[PDB]
């Protein structure tokens, strides 16, 4: 599963999960997708390379399995092509 996508950065998160800090971005391709990382800022037109992850988690209320898809970058890159 590989994704190569062009879009604009709509939101930036300095986050934390599983005892590891991460930086995430919202890519507004209008649909959107999250890019997770292990010069890019709000408003940038970027080209992203990385593994598409479905990242399924169980909802607390509905008890349903849902996708929370993201493009992982480690191989991967994020290139500002504005």
């Amino acid at each position, epitope marked *: 599963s590989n994704a190569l996508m062009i879009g604009r950065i709509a*939101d*930036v*998160q*300095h*986050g*934390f*999960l*599983g005892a590891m*800090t*991460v930086t*995430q971005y*919202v890519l507004e391709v209008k649909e*959107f997708i*999250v890019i*997770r990382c292990m010069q890019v800022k709000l408003g940038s037109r970027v080209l992203v390379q990385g593994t598409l992850r479905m*990242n399924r*988690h169980v909802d*607390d*209320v509905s008890k349903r399995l849902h996708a*929370y898809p993201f493009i992982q970058v480690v191989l991967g890159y994020v290139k500002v092509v504005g």
Partner: nanobody
Amino acid sequence: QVQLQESGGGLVQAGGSLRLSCAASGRTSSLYSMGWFRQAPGKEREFVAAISRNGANTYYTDSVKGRFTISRDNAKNTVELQMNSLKPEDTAVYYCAADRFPTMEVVTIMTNEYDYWGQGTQVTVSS
């Protein structure tokens, strides 16, 4: 569109405990990470504790680790902060905040990335 309501604060003695609650109403469907923040009178607003939308990942500022516990219930749209072993240094106005960043499991650990803020509830610790 979104209203945040803090409750449960007030006055306590050193070593004592309080439980702060934050109820969220309006379009809560756009809320993800929830966090507690504080402002001592005269200083910058600072991160205390935060929790992800699914409640699987939590984060704490170093000086409240082992004393403070954050939790949430998504059916009631509330985030809670159990404050134990309180110190004079913890005296501040406490705010609950919400982030719009659409993520399930990742907790937002940066103050300026939070979008929604409540009016605040005063917490005073004396010896």
